[PDB]
Write a protein that binds this ligand. Structure first.
Ligand SMILES: *[C@@H]1O[C@H](CO)[C@@H](O)[C@H](O)[C@H]1NC(C)=O
Ligand SMILES: *[C@@H]1O[C@H](CO)[C@@H](O)[C@H](O)[C@H]1NC(C)=O
Lengths: 437, 437
């Protein structure tokens, strides 16, 4: 039978359900979420690194003109100087004194170590969740990896599964992210061509081995004043290094919902946000006939000094009388109560002891011992341990959160006040009726 | 000087503009969009083609039983068959009389011709637009490939131009696009792992040469009733061929505003939608000092043979008695009328005949004949032909479509009705004044 069921998408915390057809015995569906990868659609938009800003040797022409042409090479600052006099070791460098032209040109290039120290800037638009489920039914165990997109099955040969649309869309990455050496940043980098000097992406290329490199690093060229030849340039500081100085915090540290971010590809593992509805097609071979199943006749339950916590600190004792031997599954239909064992053994009119975990101060729930119903209504104390090392397995509800005695005095007080108003109105009605006569 | 102007996005249709600055004189401006590529970002969801449904050699063996194992081949289908007894040419293929076993097997691989006859599935996310721009100012022509996404300089060597956001971003592509053989289609394909029998995406892969392929076409294998060895299988029709039968028309013939769509890369060039803000900073050398500009003592205007249309059919004649010589720019300050020319060689005293287009019957406009203003009135005749080969030049406003006679008669009727209302209230007021006495 196809059984739709809502499961929290937290890693760990095994979730339990009971499947049942009216002509068949109940079976213990066991569904556990192991992994949850949020791999979004990521496309590379540029790559940047610290520039090498290498300057070529200057050109000299002497008693003439040396006007330079435009170039198709990154950040080509070209300027000519008149009235110069280059002088290397040995003597002067041309033959005129005053009428001279020095062609000083400068460009930038990727540093030799940009193969590693490089930040790639991408856009992230839509994230889809892949979830691994371990499901055991009728002591048959299957692990399978599926999607949450709502229309995709997985290992359908053993068990047919659909994981529908998740209740909440997280998308921890924003629209526009930066990747550096395994660290993720939500940086609003400038687009391709918005070439601000001194900030991130001051030099960008399409790929790491590419000649399509653009840079607007502000290189101001100065006319030399010394007797020797050199090219004096003053350049804006590397915006890659300035961004690295005040990048902020990576998403291995600031990811909500406990996400752990991995690179190559970009993904967010072990995220616990919302709930997922999944429809499970239980195969008919796993169904066991109710005639073969040992039926139960009398059931009763009295818990003994439970606790409510993330730990499995409560225990039922179940009194019963049945007709035959065999193991049957036990499940609680209340959202407050989840048990420990998905099945137990019932032989003949004895006793059994089971464990559970709850969150309400009142332990009011229903137990399906070998099927049917068994209502347990009791009370137990809050825990003494302040902090626990495992997540809470039960979501709180306002109806269950308020304790039973608290409902008792609140209901009695509100009923008393309302009774005062009712008796006052009744006295008014009776008094008006008598004074009318 | 920053001169922000709004230019129609329509390709071709050169845009006149005027740059006036105090002391730096009027100057012509020529803004033309030559090409407008709209390149989005796409991610390859999967590839698909015709499958091959290869049936391997059968595994028959005798006086025994066979049990297959799961394989990683796409759409792996076992069936073990008892009681088989195969024949080839020569006789029985095995010893054992009746109790036998044969493992009938079938899986799915690519066709040999998937290298060309394949369809890729892409998720078009968001399209940014790029304009090749041709700007002519004074006697200087420049071409620059600018980005339209926001602040991005173009040809920064001589003329920094910033193209703002588009007025209304219209995407010809839907969120899902299938490309086959250079033809694009807006097909909502099933996602990865959402295979269906007899439908598109029945076989999916990351690439054509990839081995991690998967398919869910309904192959079922039947018991071989014939005496000879044979593997009978019935399989659902190829969803690729079924989609090819009824794919519908491609987007090269259904795209709004008429881009030409071409692939590698996926792009849609030269639609015509909306308006674009462009801020241009003209270099200071191009401005002429206002002293050398030959100004007019006084202008005049007249029209001849007006035909309001998409063509430059209207003709006007202007009289001048300028004080000096030389060429100087002329421009029309009309949102509903644009001139043909951009400059005129004014010479002392004489007459200039020029051409213009307009989309209003009452062609009244203000033009600047090489300075100041010139008011022109024309009662412009309707066009003769019904269909014109080249597009329009101005957009029609509500006040422009109404001719002078229409304003006269309509305003006369509303004025008459309002006059009756006013005189009625006046007569009521004075009648109340007389009866108050
Ligand atoms: C940049 O790095 C220097 C190096 O010492 C550091 O002092 C400074 O705080 C960093 N940040 C800024 C914003 O200057
Ligand atoms: C499919 O192909 C057949 C083959 O003749 C053709 O008649 C039919 O129009 C095509 N389309 C549909 C939607 O059946």
């Amino acid at each position: 039978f196809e059984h739709a069921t809502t499961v929290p998408n937290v890693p760990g915390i095994p979730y339990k359900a009971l499947v049942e057809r009216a002509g068949y015995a109940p079976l213990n569906l066991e569904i556990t979420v192991v992994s949850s990868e949020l791999t979004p659609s990521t496309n590379k938009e540029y790559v940047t690194c610290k520039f090498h800003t290498v300057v070529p040797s200057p050109q000299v022409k002497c008693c003439g003109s040396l006007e330079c042409k435009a170039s198709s090479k990154a950040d080509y600052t070209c300027r000519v100087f008149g009235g110069v006099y280059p002088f290397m070791w040995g003597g002067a460098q041309c033959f005129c004194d005053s009428e001279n032209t020095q062609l000083s040109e400068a460009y930038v290039e990727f540093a030799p170590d940009c193969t590693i120290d490089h930040a790639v800037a991408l856009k992230v638009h839509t994230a889809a969740l892949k979830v691994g489920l371990r499901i055991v039914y009728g002591n048959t165990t299957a692990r399978l990896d599926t999607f949450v997109n709502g229309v995709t099955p997985g290992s359908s040969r053993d068990l047919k599964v659909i994981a529908g649309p998740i209740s909440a869309a997280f998308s921890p990455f924003d629209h526009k992210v930066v990747i550096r050496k395994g660290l993720v940043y939500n940086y609003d980098f400038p687009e391709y061509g918005a070439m601000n000097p001194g900030a991130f992406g001051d030099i960008q290329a399409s790929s790491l081995d590419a000649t399509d490199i653009v840079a607007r690093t502000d290189i101001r060229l100065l006319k030399p004043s010394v007797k020797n030849i050199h090219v004096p340039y003053t350049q804006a500081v590397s915006g890659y290094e300035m961004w690295k100085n005040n990048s902020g915090r990576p998403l291995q540290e600031t990811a909500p919902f406990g996400c752990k971010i991995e690179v190559e590809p970009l993904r967010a593992t072990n995220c616990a946000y919302g709930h997922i509805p999944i429809s499970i097609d239980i195969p008919d071979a796993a169904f066991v006939r109710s005639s073969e199943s040992p039926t139960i006749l009398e059931v009763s339950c009295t818990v003994a000094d439970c606790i409510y916590s993330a730990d499995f600190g409560g225990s039922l004792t179940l009194q019963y009388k049945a007709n035959r031997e065999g193991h049957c599954p036990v499940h609680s239909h209340s959202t407050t109560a989840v048990l420990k064992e998905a099945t137990t053994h019932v032989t003949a009119t004895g006793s059994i002891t089971l464990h559970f975990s709850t969150s309400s101060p009142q332990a009011n729930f229903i137990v399906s011992l070998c099927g049917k119903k068994t209502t347990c209504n009791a009370e137990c104390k809050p825990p003494a341990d302040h902090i626990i090392g495992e997540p809470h397995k039960v979501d709180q509800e306002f109806q269950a959160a308020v304790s039973k005695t608290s409902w008792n005095w609140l209901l009695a007080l509100f009923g008393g006040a309302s009774s005062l108003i009712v008796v006052g109105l009744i006295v008014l009605v009776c008094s008006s009726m008598l004074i009318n006569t």
